Design an enzyme around this catalytic site. Structure first.
Site, PDB file in Angstrom:
ATOM      1  N   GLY A  44      10.438   1.907   0.205  1.00  0.00           N
ATOM      2  CA  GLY A  44      10.255   2.525   1.509  1.00  0.00           C
ATOM      3  C   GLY A  44       9.685   1.577   2.531  1.00  0.00           C
ATOM      4  N   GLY A  46       7.213   2.125   5.916  1.00  0.00           N
ATOM      5  CA  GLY A  46       6.403   2.998   6.750  1.00  0.00           C
ATOM      6  C   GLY A  46       6.170   2.320   8.083  1.00  0.00           C
ATOM      7  N   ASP A 154      -6.449   9.812   5.049  1.00  0.00           N
ATOM      8  CA  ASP A 154      -5.004  10.084   4.980  1.00  0.00           C
ATOM      9  C   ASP A 154      -4.649  10.819   3.727  1.00  0.00           C
ATOM     10  OD1 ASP A 154      -2.473  10.161   6.147  1.00  0.00           O
ATOM     11  OD2 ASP A 154      -1.968   8.153   5.537  1.00  0.00           O
TER      12      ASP A 154
HETATM   13  N1  LIG Z   1       1.478   2.248  -7.035  1.00  0.00           N
HETATM   14  C1  LIG Z   1       2.614   2.845  -6.693  1.00  0.00           C
HETATM   15  N2  LIG Z   1       3.453   3.253  -7.676  1.00  0.00           N
HETATM   16  C2  LIG Z   1       4.609   3.828  -7.328  1.00  0.00           C
HETATM   17  N3  LIG Z   1       5.091   4.076  -6.114  1.00  0.00           N
HETATM   18  C3  LIG Z   1       4.246   3.657  -5.160  1.00  0.00           C
HETATM   19  C4  LIG Z   1       3.023   3.050  -5.363  1.00  0.00           C
HETATM   20  N4  LIG Z   1       2.426   2.753  -4.150  1.00  0.00           N
HETATM   21  C5  LIG Z   1       3.279   3.174  -3.253  1.00  0.00           C
HETATM   22  N5  LIG Z   1       4.402   3.742  -3.798  1.00  0.00           N
HETATM   23  C6  LIG Z   1       5.535   4.276  -3.058  1.00  0.00           C
HETATM   24  O1  LIG Z   1       5.795   3.378  -2.007  1.00  0.00           O
HETATM   25  C7  LIG Z   1       5.874   4.065  -0.734  1.00  0.00           C
HETATM   26  C8  LIG Z   1       4.755   3.600   0.173  1.00  0.00           C
HETATM   27  O2  LIG Z   1       3.442   3.974  -0.315  1.00  0.00           O
HETATM   28  P1  LIG Z   1       2.237   3.853   0.745  1.00  0.00           P
HETATM   29  O3  LIG Z   1       2.784   3.449   2.075  1.00  0.00           O
HETATM   30  O4  LIG Z   1       1.101   3.069   0.176  1.00  0.00           O
HETATM   31  O5  LIG Z   1       1.776   5.374   0.820  1.00  0.00           O
HETATM   32  P2  LIG Z   1       2.558   6.593   1.470  1.00  0.00           P
HETATM   33  O6  LIG Z   1       3.903   6.043   1.869  1.00  0.00           O
HETATM   34  O7  LIG Z   1       2.675   7.659   0.405  1.00  0.00           O
HETATM   35  O8  LIG Z   1       1.719   6.990   2.652  1.00  0.00           O
HETATM   36  C9  LIG Z   1       5.944   5.559  -1.070  1.00  0.00           C
HETATM   37  O9  LIG Z   1       7.302   5.989  -1.073  1.00  0.00           O
HETATM   38  C10 LIG Z   1       5.304   5.659  -2.457  1.00  0.00           C
HETATM   39  O10 LIG Z   1       5.927   6.650  -3.245  1.00  0.00           O
END
Ligand SMILES: Nc1ncnc2c1ncn2[C@@H]1O[C@H](COP(=O)(O)OP(=O)(O)O)[C@@H](O)[C@H]1O
Ligand SMILES: N#CCc1c[nH]c2cc(Cl)c(Br)cc12
Length: 327
Positions: A44, A46, A154
């Site tokens: 992803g 953000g 958050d």
């Molecule tokens: N340690 C992790 N293990 C698996 N997936 C993760 C992990 N950290 C983040 N993700 C995935 O990566 C993306 C970005 O996470 P992050 O930006 O830190 O938090 P969020 O997007 O949930 O606010 C999300 O889609 C999340 O599911």
């Protein structure tokens, strides 16, 4: 002007800790080897980072790499310091390494991978017992970061990673987290719209750990009532109106009066007059299996306008809603 406020718990944590603990700007970053990680696939992107599934080739273990975007790597030392301070804490995501990305030329945070159960699948099938079990696990993470002088800011379902097979939970995404210092005025442009506490919506800057307990209550309400999100504001102003349609306008005006807040005049034409609704008004045949008098009482103690009146994480762990959870 507005009356000051302080947390009712963990007020002195950052004054009793050494300055090295919270003075993140003075922290010297220990940079690892970027070559230890092979990016596999993009998970992803953000507003602040691009997240990748990757392999740590030194142990062939899956990791997650968050590559900060140029714009807001500025506040990287704050996120690094918080992650390093909380490392090994109950249900806190583990920061494995910090490397310089060879393409972006920005910091890349390497995290332990969580084989997270699909989000929709969790929302749709967690049982009453599982909701209690995982809420207890989130509370252990929040009491730990609050006891360590940090507010997450958050809390929302996408920031709570559940590996349902291993009954494992991790609180992630510490990019908005901050150190709590009594009397500090914070930025109200934190949390996601549906999880924003009334203190943010009325522009009260001297908030504390209790913001996370409001956000947690929004999560719980959405889960038990099968209403995603529970407070569905069209924007930040309408978000407060959606809250007032449930909690009532009189307790809102008492909250504003207590803290001597100057309410945005934009609210005069949209807030209306509303009486608190009894929580049973949200119960129906499709959510009855998730509702109990104990869930409703617990929810009522989180979702309060007055941030000083909400349950703390440690008090919440004592609540009857968790008596059925195996400890
Ligand atoms: N340690 C992790 N293990 C698996 N997936 C993760 C992990 N950290 C983040 N993700 C995935 O990566 C993306 C970005 O996470 P992050 O930006 O830190 O938090 P969020 O997007 O949930 O606010 C999300 O889609 C999340 O599911
Ligand atoms: N909403 C939703 C699904 C979901 C994602 N992460 C969670 C954490 C907890 Cl603690 C609970 Br209960 C539910 C979820």
């Amino acid at each position: 002007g507005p009356v000051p406020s302080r947390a009712r718990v963990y007020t002195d944590v950052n004054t009793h800790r050494p300055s090295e603990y919270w003075d993140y700007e003075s922290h010297v970053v220990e940079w690892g080897n970027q070559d230890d990680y092979q990016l596999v696939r993009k998970l992803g992107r953000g507003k602040y980072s691009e997240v990748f599934e990757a392999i740590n080739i030194t142990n062939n273990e899956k990791v997650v790499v968050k590559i900060l975007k140029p714009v807001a790597a500025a506040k990287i030392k704050r996120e690094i310091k918080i992650l390093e301070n909380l490392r090994g804490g109950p249900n806190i995501i583990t920061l494995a390494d910090i490397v310089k990305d060879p393409v972006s030329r920005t910091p890349a945070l390497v995290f332990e991978h969580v084989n997270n159960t699909d989000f929709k699948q969790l929302y749709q099938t967690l049982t009453d017992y599982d909701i209690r079990f995982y809420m207890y696990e989130i509370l252990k993470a929040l009491d730990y970061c609050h006891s360590m002088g940090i507010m997450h800011r958050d809390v929302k379902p996408h920031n709570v990673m559940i590996d349902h097979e291993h009954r494992k939970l991790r609180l992630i995404d510490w990019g908005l987290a901050e150190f709590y210092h009594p009397g500090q005025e914070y930025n109200v442009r934190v949390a996601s719209r549906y999880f924003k506490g009334p203190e943010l919506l009325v522009d009260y800057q001297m908030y504390d750990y209790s913001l996370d307990m409001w956000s947690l209550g929004c999560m719980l309400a959405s889960m038990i009532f099968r209403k995603e999100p529970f407070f569905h504001g069209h924007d930040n102003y309408d978000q407060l109106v959606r809250i007032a349609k449930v909690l009532g306008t009189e307790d809102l005006y008492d909250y504003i009066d207590k803290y001597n807040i100057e309410l945005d005049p934009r609210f005069n034409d949209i807030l209306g007059r509303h009486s608190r609704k009894r929580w049973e008004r949200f119960v129906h045949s499709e959510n009855q299996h998730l509702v109990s008098p104990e869930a409703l009482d617990f929810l009522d103690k989180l979702l309060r306008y007055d941030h000083q009146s909400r349950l703390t994480a440690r008090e919440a762990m004592e609540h009857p809603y968790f008596y059925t959870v195996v400890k």
